[PDB]
Amino acid sequence: REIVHIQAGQCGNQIGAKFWEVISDEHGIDPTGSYHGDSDLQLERINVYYNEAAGNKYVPRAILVDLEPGTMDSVRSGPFGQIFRPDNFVFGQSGAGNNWAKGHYTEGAELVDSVLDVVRKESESCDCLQGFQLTHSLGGGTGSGMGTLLISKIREEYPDRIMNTFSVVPSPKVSDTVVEPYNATLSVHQLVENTDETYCIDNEALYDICFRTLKLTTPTYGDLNHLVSATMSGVTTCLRFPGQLNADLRKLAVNMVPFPRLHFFMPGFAPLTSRGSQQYRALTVPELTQQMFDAKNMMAACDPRHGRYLTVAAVFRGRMSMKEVDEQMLNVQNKNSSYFVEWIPNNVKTAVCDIPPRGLKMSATFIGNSTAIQELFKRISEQFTAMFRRKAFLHWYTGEGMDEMEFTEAESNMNDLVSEYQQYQD
Amino acid sequence: RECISIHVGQAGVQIGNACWELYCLEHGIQPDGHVPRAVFVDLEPTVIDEVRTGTYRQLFHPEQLITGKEDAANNYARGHYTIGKEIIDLVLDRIRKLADQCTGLQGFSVFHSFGGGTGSGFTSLLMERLSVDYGKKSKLEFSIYPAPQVSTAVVEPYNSILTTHTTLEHSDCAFMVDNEAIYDICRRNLDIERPTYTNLNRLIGQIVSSITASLRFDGALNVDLTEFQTNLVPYPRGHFPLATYAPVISAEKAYHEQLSVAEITNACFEPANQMVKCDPRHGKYMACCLLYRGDVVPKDVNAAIATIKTKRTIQFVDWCPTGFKVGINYEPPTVVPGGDLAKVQRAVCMLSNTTAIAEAWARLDHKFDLMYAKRAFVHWYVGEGMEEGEFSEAREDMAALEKDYEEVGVDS
Amino acid sequence: ITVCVRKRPISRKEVNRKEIDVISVPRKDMLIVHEPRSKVDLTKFLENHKFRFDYAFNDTCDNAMVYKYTAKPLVKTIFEGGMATCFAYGQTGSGKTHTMGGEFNGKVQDCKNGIYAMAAKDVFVTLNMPRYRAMNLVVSASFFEIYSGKVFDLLSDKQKLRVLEDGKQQVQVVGLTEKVVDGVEEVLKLIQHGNAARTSGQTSANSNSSRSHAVFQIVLRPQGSTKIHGKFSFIDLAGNEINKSLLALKECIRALGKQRVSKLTQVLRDSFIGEKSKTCMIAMISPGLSSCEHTLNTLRYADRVKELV
């Protein structure tokens, strides 16, 4: 099987560097080097993310889409930056304006064809394609607009292969941009109707989870990114490993989406202990479920405790008892019968790889489909209206060839999306 | 990513030399280092010459220094139409030659002095020709609008009611720094009855450094230029916020310097510290961009601001829940080696749109009428390719700027 | 809401095949299905099921006759300022295209013969009547098809159109082309044009195909009004995305009585919401024994729709 990553925008891009920083080491691939793999198993399934050309050069099969040179020229001028074949860099030296409209209708719409071109060169690579990984932020141009287009096109070209989306939904407390809800509401819209698996991460849900669950005092972006990339590795790549009970994107999809919206999840990693001290090793297993299922530790902003779950997928990856795994999951399902929805006898989807995260003994990625994420699109949707009402920075959109009915559309859509999700919380 | 700058008018050039000074000063690039990223326009050679004779002499390219040996003329008309015209092409050429060389820019920080000849008129058409050649960017013009009672030129208003109406439909965000209301700061918050123009310049030269310089510079809460206009203008009128700085303490007299955030932020809303004689006499803020720099804990802010949001006597507009764009930078400010600026390890350059200017514009409009009412120095413009139209029709213009700044506030 | 059923006669191909005619319409509103069945022992028996409709049409009935009972009564509704919809529903080859578009076993032929044309004819005549003349109405027509959630303008060379929805939730199809018509001849031209352009697969040996939803509309406009004086949407449904639309359609029509989205229901939504709106559903049935399963499916669907009545 296979997949083809997609680094839309700067963020989605910045993260690319971290997702690939990791994944590679979790596959023994040095900058341009080959497979130094401490083992021999980190190779029989690599294909999922690379391509064979030389014999020591397995190149990441991702796409780097962005209308701001400097960015990709920071990712390509640093560490692992020199492993991507230049063909991968689909830049847009234009003005990468922070407008969803500027990267979806006017500026991005041009650079698109020169992207799809490659997304096909990579898809028609070899063997059988599974789906595409998509990273980006719903709070900017090259991210929400242009990346949200990249998919609307992808999903027309292969409505068969899957589409996981890793979105950095606009954090609450403080917005790292101003129109944010504009660029956001507009991209979520496109998401709820193309990709079929979305993993929403919040820069501040991370800080928290990174400053209190990792006594880490100076959580640089690199970190946040790093933590995130840690989860997306547990998801995909991982399951493309052996296991007593293994799954793969689809299983994950076909066990997690009760209703076609596409629904968004909230990823959570397992061993998340501070370096030295904490290295408690309390990782027998009840310790991992202890972790994963708590409020804090959910990369999302919202707290599960604020709304039932529809599905859950503990994708563990480290030798354990299909008994102490299958078992724990249960008590968990009974101690919290309250929030776990009922019309699904077994919400949880236990998954079990074998080999764990390179240096760790036992981990377990969590992919939750809780109704709690209602209380986020609400947020976003609110911010919109409060500012849409006055058409705040709307001239930067319309003036870019947009529509007063376009914004209406998205909000509603994504706004209805909130509605539905409640239809199950009840 | 970048932001070109066009310093127009002797003043905009003096202030320019200043803001341009503070720059290298906090970037370790002495007299002769890299290459600027702006231009200088004036219809009076002797002034741009000062940049050609005095300090920061070789840090510029005789190409980004435009001059029209001809005549300045403290009159809009002449500077905009008649004379100023001849140069514009050439002027543009640089902001098209300098705009190309770069990599995905963001806009042009324009520096002009509202009530001048080369500053009001000229720019009027410079910004004019920009809004069309790059409508797809930011046009933040940093102005030094007419001292409330201490104006200079006899006509000033003619020149400022005219630079406002012609630029209004072309700027993105117009920053304003009142020449007089800055003196107060030099008298009351620094103590000195000897303020040379070279000082006011060091000041804006500061507040400005907080805008571009440091902001376009990495930090814990970056704020792009676009960011401004977005988080700063509620309506298309090239809305004019006001610039304010916090640690404007004297580097000699008093010394309490160590004035934790909680203090420097409160020191922004007291009207006696805002580089503008627009004392919040009633003007409800409608959006403030608190740009901090130096050692600042986000909670300190996301608290110091909270305390403010609940002072009520600071009444924010209705239709605006929260209007506080918190911009955090790292590197503390950088004071002139030995001017008169304290030199703290944290500052607050807060700018904002306040229903207050309802005043400032009013008081400046009224001026105009009085003279127009008698045509006063009208023959000076007419004879310079203008008409009863441009005046009367630019008066009506601002009229709806007195109603605009009135409607967007005072009402719920 | 009115629901009718129309049985088509067995075609020559079916007859040659010696297909048995399973359906009877003994009365104006009674339709009987003589379902063949076998017990486990394989005993043959007939389970005759009875269905009642506002109007049930026999194989003899012409399009004019069918039109008289279904669509014709709706035309006045648009002049009244309402919104009317007429749907042709049924299995593939049941006769939906024939009835709406014009007589053809290929479903494509004489426009004049079909309901779109007949309805148009009545529109011009009524507009001319004294009560209406004062109205000073202009007649416009549009024709588009919905295929896999996509809308295509049949009037403008299959041009793909975008559909947006406001917060208000009113839907608009931007780019849809409205053509001014002042004569039935005009409408016939547009029908011919649209029908030629209609979606399908390769040239089949015979017959058209209903991969899509066909919708021809007649709009009346003074200068807006309720966004136009009145509108009549005639829909040629695809053989019973398709399932979701049909499910969606049922709920919208039933909602009409009282007052899982799809493209078709989205575009049509304004036609269900208003108080002054009427709809007619015509269920097409192919009489062959082989089609018995299909027919019961069609009939049951019909029953639920009428149920709202």
Swiss-Prot record, chain A:
It comes from the Eukaryota. Some glutamate residues at the C-terminus are polyglycylated, resulting in polyglycine chains on the gamma-carboxyl group. Glycylation is mainly limited to tubulin incorporated into axonemes (cilia and flagella) whereas glutamylation is prevalent in neuronal cells, centrioles, axonemes, and the mitotic spindle. Both modifications can coexist on the same protein on adjacent residues, and lowering polyglycylation levels increases polyglutamylation, and reciprocally. The precise function of polyglycylation is still unclear. GO terms for cellular component: cytoplasm; microtubule; microtubule cytoskeleton. The modification Phosphoserine is found at S39, S171. The modification Phosphothreonine is found at A54, T284, T289. One of its GO terms (biological process) is mitotic cell cycle. Keywords: Acetylation, Cytoplasm, Cytoskeleton, GTP-binding, Isopeptide bond, Magnesium, Metal-binding, Methylation, Microtubule, Neurogenesis, Nucleotide-binding, Phosphoprotein, Ubl conjugation. Its main location: cytoplasm. Coiled coil: none annotated. The modification N6-succinyllysine is found at K57. SUPFAM superfamilies: Tubulin C-terminal domain-like, Tubulin nucleotide-binding domain-like. Its cofactor is Mg(2+). There is a cross-link at K57, K323 (Glycyl lysine isopeptide (Lys-Gly) (interchain with G-Cter in ubiquitin)). Mg(2+) binds at E68. It is found in: Cytoplasm, Cytoskeleton. InterPro entries: Beta-tubulin_BS (IPR013838), Beta_tubulin (IPR002453), Tub_FtsZ_C (IPR008280), Tubulin (IPR000217), Tubulin/FtsZ-like_C (IPR037103), Tubulin/FtsZ_2-layer-sand-dom (IPR018316), Tubulin/FtsZ_GTPase_sf (IPR036525), Tubulin_C (IPR023123). The modification N6-acetyllysine is found at K57. Pfam families: Tubulin, Tubulin_C. A motif (MREI motif) lies at residues 1-3. GTP binds at Q10, E68, S137, G141, T142, G143, N203, N225. The modification Omega-N-methylarginine is found at R317. The MREI motif is common among all beta-tubulin isoforms and may be critical for tubulin autoregulation. Belongs to the tubulin family. This is Tubulin beta-2B chain. The gene is TUBB2B.
From Swiss-Prot, chain B:
It is found in: Cytoplasm, Cytoskeleton. The keyword Repeat does not apply. InterPro entries: Alpha_tubulin, Tub_FtsZ_C, Tubulin, Tubulin/FtsZ-like_C, Tubulin/FtsZ_2-layer-sand-dom, Tubulin/FtsZ_GTPase_sf, Tubulin_C, Tubulin_CS. Its EC number is 3.6.5.-. The modification 3'-nitrotyrosine is found at Y255. Mg(2+) binds at E44. Its main location: cytoplasm. It holds the Pfam family Tubulin. Some glutamate residues at the C-terminus are polyglycylated, resulting in polyglycine chains on the gamma-carboxyl group. Glycylation is mainly limited to tubulin incorporated into axonemes (cilia and flagella) whereas glutamylation is prevalent in neuronal cells, centrioles, axonemes, and the mitotic spindle. Both modifications can coexist on the same protein on adjacent residues, and lowering polyglycylation levels increases polyglutamylation, and reciprocally. Cilia and flagella glycylation is required for their stability and maintenance. Flagella glycylation controls sperm motility. Some glutamate residues at the C-terminus are polyglutamylated, resulting in polyglutamate chains on the gamma-carboxyl group. Polyglutamylation plays a key role in microtubule severing by spastin (SPAST). SPAST preferentially recognizes and acts on microtubules decorated with short polyglutamate tails: severing activity by SPAST increases as the number of glutamates per tubulin rises from one to eight, but decreases beyond this glutamylation threshold. Glutamylation is also involved in cilia motility. Tubulin is the major constituent of microtubules, a cylinder consisting of laterally associated linear protofilaments composed of alpha- and beta-tubulin heterodimers. Microtubules grow by the addition of GTP-tubulin dimers to the microtubule end, where a stabilizing cap forms. Below the cap, tubulin dimers are in GDP-bound state, owing to GTPase activity of alpha-tubulin.
Curated annotation (Swiss-Prot), chain C:
Disruption phenotype: Marked perturbation of mitotic spindle architecture. RNAi-knockdown in the male germline abolishes the asymmetric enrichment of Alms1a to the mother centrosome. It is found in: Cytoplasm, Cytoskeleton, Microtubule organizing center, Centrosome; Cytoplasm, Cytoskeleton, Spindle pole; Chromosome, Centromere. This is Kinesin-like protein Klp10A. Belongs to the TRAFAC class myosin-kinesin ATPase superfamily. Kinesin family. MCAK/KIF2 subfamily. Residues 1-308 form the Kinesin motor domain. Expressed in male germline stem cells and spermatogonia (at protein level). Interacts with Alms1a (via C-terminus). It comes from the Eukaryota. Required during anaphase to drive sister chromatid separation to promote flux by actively depolymerizing kinetochore microtubules at their pole-associated minus ends, thereby moving chromatids through a 'poleward flux'. Involved in asymmetric cell division of sensory organ precursor (SOP) cells by playing a role in the asymmetric localization of Sara-expressing endosomes to the pIIa daughter cell but not to the pIIb cell. Klp98A targets Sara-expressing endosomes to the central spindle which is symmetrically arranged in early cell division. It comes from Drosophila melanogaster. ATP binds at G90, Q91, T92, G93, S94, G95, K96, T97.
